[PDB]
Amino acid sequence: GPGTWENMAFAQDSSAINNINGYLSYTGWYRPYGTSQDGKTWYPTTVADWRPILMYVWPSKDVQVKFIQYFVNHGYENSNYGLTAGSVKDLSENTASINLNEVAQNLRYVIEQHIVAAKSTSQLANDINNFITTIPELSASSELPDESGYGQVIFVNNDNTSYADSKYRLMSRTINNQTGNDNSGDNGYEFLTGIDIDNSNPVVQAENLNWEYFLLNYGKLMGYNPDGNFDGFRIDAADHIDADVLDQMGQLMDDMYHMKGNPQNANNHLSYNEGYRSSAARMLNKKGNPQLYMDYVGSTLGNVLGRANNRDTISNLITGSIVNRQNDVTENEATPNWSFVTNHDQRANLINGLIIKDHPGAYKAEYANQAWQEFYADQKKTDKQYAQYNVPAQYAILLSNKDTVPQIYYGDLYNETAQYMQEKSIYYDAITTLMKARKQFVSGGQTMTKLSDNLIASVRYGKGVANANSEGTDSLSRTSGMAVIVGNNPQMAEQTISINMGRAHANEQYRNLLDTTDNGLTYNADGAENPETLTTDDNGILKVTVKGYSNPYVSGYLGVWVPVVSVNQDVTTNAATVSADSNKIFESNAALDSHMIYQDFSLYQPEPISTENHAYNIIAQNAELFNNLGITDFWMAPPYTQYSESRYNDGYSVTDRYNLGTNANPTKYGSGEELANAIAALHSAGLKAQVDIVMNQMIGLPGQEAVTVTRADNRGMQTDVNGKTYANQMYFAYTTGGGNGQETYGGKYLSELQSKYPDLFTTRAISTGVAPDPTTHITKWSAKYENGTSLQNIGIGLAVKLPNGEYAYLRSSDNKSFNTLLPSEIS
Numbered sequence: 001g002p003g004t005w006e007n008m009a010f011a012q013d014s015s016a017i018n019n020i021n022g023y024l025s026y027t028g029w030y031r032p033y034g035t036s037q038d039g040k041t042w043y044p045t046t047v048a049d050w051r052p053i054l055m056y057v058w059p060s061k062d063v064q065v066k067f068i069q070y071f072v073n074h075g076y077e078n079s080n081y082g083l084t085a086g087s088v089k090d091l092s093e094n095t096a097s098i099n100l101n102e103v104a105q106n107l108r109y110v111i112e113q114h115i116v117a118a119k120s121t122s123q124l125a126n127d128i129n130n131f132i133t134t135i136p137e138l139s140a141s142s143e144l145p146d147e148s149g150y151g152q153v154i155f156v157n158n159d160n161t162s163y164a165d166s167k168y169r170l171m172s173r174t175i176n177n178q179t180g181n182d183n184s185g186d187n188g189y190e191f192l193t194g195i196d197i198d199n200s201n202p203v204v205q206a207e208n209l210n211w212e213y214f215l216l217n218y219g220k221l222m223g224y225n226p227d228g229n230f231d232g233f234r235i236d237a238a239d240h241i242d243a244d245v246l247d248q249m250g251q252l253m254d255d256m257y258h259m260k261g262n263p264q265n266a267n268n269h270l271s272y273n274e275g276y277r278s279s280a281a282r283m284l285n286k287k288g289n290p291q292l293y294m295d296y297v298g299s300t301l302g303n304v305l306g307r308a309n310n311r312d313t314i315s316n317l318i319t320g321s322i323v324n325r326q327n328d329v330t331e332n333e334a335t336p337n338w339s340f341v342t343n344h345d346q347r348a349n350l351i352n353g354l355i356i357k358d359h360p361g362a363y364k365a366e367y368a369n370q371a372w373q374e375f376y377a378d379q380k381k382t383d384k385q386y387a388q389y390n391v392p393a394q395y396a397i398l399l400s401n402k403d404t405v406p407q408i409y410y411g412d413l414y415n416e417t418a419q420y421m422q423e424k425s426i427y428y429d430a431i432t433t434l435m436k437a438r439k440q441f442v443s444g445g446q447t448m449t450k451l452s453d454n455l456i457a458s459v460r461y462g463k464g465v466a467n468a469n470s471e472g473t474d475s476l477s478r479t480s481g482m483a484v485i486v487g488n489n490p491q492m493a494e495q496t497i498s499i500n501m502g503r504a505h506a507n508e509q510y511r512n513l514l515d516t517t518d519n520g521l522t523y524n525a526d527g528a529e530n531p532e533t534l535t536t537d538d539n540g541i542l543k544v545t546v547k548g549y550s551n552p553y554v555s556g557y558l559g560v561w562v563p564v565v566s567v568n569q570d571v572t573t574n575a576a577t578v579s580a581d582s583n584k585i586f587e588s589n590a591a592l593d594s595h596m597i598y599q600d601f602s603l604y605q606p607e608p609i610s611t612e613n614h615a616y617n618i619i620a621q622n623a624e625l626f627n628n629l630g631i632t633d634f635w636m637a638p639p640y641t642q643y644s645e646s647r648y649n650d651g652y653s654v655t656d657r658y659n660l661g662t663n664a665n666p667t668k669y670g671s672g673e674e675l676a677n678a679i680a681a682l683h684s685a686g687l688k689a690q691v692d693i694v695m696n697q698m699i700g701l702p703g704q705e706a707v708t709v710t711r712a713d714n715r716g717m718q719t720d721v722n723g724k725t726y727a728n729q730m731y732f733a734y735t736t737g738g739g740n741g742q743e744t745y746g747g748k749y750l751s752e753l754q755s756k757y758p759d760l761f762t763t764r765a766i767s768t769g770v771a772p773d774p775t776t777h778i779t780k781w782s783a784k785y786e787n788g789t790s791l792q793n794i795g796i797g798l799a800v801k802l803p804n805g806e807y808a809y810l811r812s813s814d815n816k817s818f819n820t821l822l823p824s825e826i827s
């Protein structure tokens with residue numbers, strides 16, 4: 001017959017009870033055998049009638065009382081069941097168990113009334129979520145965020161979560177701590193954000209090689225445009241992943257394209273690593289430079305020229321880089337690097353900050369339109385507060401700098417929040433003019449001479465001219481080279497300066513390529529203090545008039561002088577097929593200097609309002625434009641499928657590593673078909689394409705897994721957050737996903753890789769002393785292949801523990817470790 005025995009779960013399996021690897025949650029729901037609204041009549045539940053576990057079971061009698069008090073005070077009161085503000089206000093943990101259970105049961109009758117009345121379990125679900133916030137232990141605050149609202153947990157071994165155990169999880173094995181013999185050193189930390197991937201696990205190291213091979217043959221393998229294949233990689237968070245994968249990538253690329261011997265093969269398959277840690281340059285040089293080091297001159301440029309106040313001296317442009325350019329007259333000595341003006345987190349770190357100013361640390365509703373309108377408005381002004389000063393001047397330095405592959409930002413050529421390449425920025429004309437000038441003029445040795453604290457003269461001596469004294473070996477020697485004068489003081493006094501152009505440029509006329517005026521810059525010398533053409537003296541000295549200007553384009557001075565010519569000229573050095581050093585992959589020389597990278601995306605790039613607006617489609621239309629500007633290499637956005645609730649949909653919140661978009665379901669950039677056509681369009685114009693490869697993290701994995709966690713710092717060592725900490729805690733983290741792409745293409749090309757390139761899976765990795773393992777294919781990511789996750793806003797108190805101290809467990813289909821053990825109220 002009927003009774004309170006029907007609070008029992010219909011059956012004790014996954015069919016009737018919510019569980020994550022057999023373990024119950026207070027957020028979790030279950031199907032009781034029967035429910036009741038009065039206490040007299042009990043109706044046997046159907047498989048449509050589920051109820052939350054927090055109605056029946058609680059962590060402690062304190063929370064049982066607080067659950068009763070909250071619900072009653074939030075419109076679940078009924079004096080016909082002795083439930084009113086007053087009747088439940090005096091109850092505490094010291095109240096009798098036999099008493100509280102009567103009140104909790106009487107409340108459970110009143111909740112069943114609301115479910116019928118409201119005709120759903122939606123307000124109940126809403127009220128449970130709101131109650132959990134009031135209880136500090138069940139709340140999302142229990143996982144201990146730091147003062148900045150950030151943090152991370154590490155996945156550790158445990159008897160309860162033995163499936164999620166790992167022999168590896170070698171954390172912060174980065175740069176020069178690959179061996180783990182300087183954990184406290186200059187290595188770079190493991191955790192950034194999202195679910196951190198364990199790149200120390202040999203199976204994951206094999207999956208990375210599979211993933212690289214897929215991208216290097218994307219067009220052919222997917223049956224799209226067969227020339228739609230990536231030639232290299234932009235390596236995301238290279239300083240925050242086991243450096244074994246940087247070695248293994250270098251091995252694969254050398255095996256496939258034979259780059260070690262031939263600089264031409266090397267340069268045609270360009271790879272560059274995100275991370276400016278000086279230890280990275282040291283590490284890469286020692287290995288023979290498998291990838292290009294990220295230079296920090298972009299930070300120097302923003303400090304010297306970029307700021308409104310507090311501008312660092314002009315001499316920092318000489319020394320504030322991995323390469324010293326006081327008198328750089330040598331080749332194959334400088335660290336092979338890739339530099340820029342606009343840092344890759346710069347726009348984000350400015351726009352974010354402009355939000356928390358407008359709305360002070362308030363809930364993040366998308367008023368980024370406001371922040372961007374403020375940015376665009378500020379950008380046009382002379383007296384800027386937010387946007388960079390001297391943007392043209394910063395690029396003039398970058399594009400004239402020897403021993404670097406310069407990288408242009410899409411957002412500096414175009415308004416990056418407008419539809420892709422619809423609106424040019426005010427700095428388009430300036431930067432594009434300097435870009436074309438680079439291909440024609442910029443070559444030979446470099447000398448950056450300080451004329452004052454605020455003024456500098458960066459001179460290039462032209463192709464086949466080693467230094468100031470050189471005659472000139474090449475036939476373009478005489479009619480190539482450049483002088484880039486940059487003042488960072490807008491109240492600098494009018495004065496005449498002397499610039500040593502070199503012995504090869506004695507009694508030679510020089511065109512006024514670019515000069516400053518009251519309004520901005522002039523390309524025909526109109527408005528400037530210097531005429532269209534000046535001639536050098538007998539010793540090759542140029543007399544230039546300079547003064548301090550203050551306009552939207554220049555806060556100081558900018559002047560560029562190139563030799564007078566009759567013809568189109570191209571000072572690109574062709575790479576040899578026999579290297580000076582056979583130990584090296586990449587060498588900082590005229591051949592590598594001839595290259596120029598282009599970041600083809602912004603984070604704040606908008607969703608396309610049609611197929612024509614797809615970035616891939618527009619890139620394919622303007623392949624020859626990029627070629628005209630002198631762009632050789634194309635850094636393409638991470639083209640992977642994204643977390644639907646990601647802020648930007650930028651590509652770094654990767655949900656499927658092999659799904660690059662379909663005709664019906666494209667990314668923000670477009671479909672895989674369009675990507676392949678975009679890559680082929682660039683290839684057609686003699687350009688190469690590098691893919692943004694995100695081996696560090698994955699974000700938005702929909703499958704939850706019961707994992708054991710410890711609150712750790714961003715290196716993976718346990719940390720104490722304002723006195724509090726926790727280790728060996730149950731955590732229902734989102735660990736499991738990958739999509740059909742990881743399922744379909746997961747370790748599917750390892751057979752082919754092992755047949756053609758056996759050395760890949762025999763070569764012992766430094767961090768493990770063990771080769772990558774291709775015997776297991778990763779078709780679905782889980783905790784076992786992960787170091788940890790950034791705090792997921794869930795809490796550490798959800799795991800249901802019985803009065804005896806043991807976790808509540810179910811012996812489900814796959815869940816079969818220990819014996820079934822449910823709370824008293826659910827059996």
Ligand code: NA
Pocket residue numbers: 189190191192196197240241696697
């Ligand atoms: Na990492």
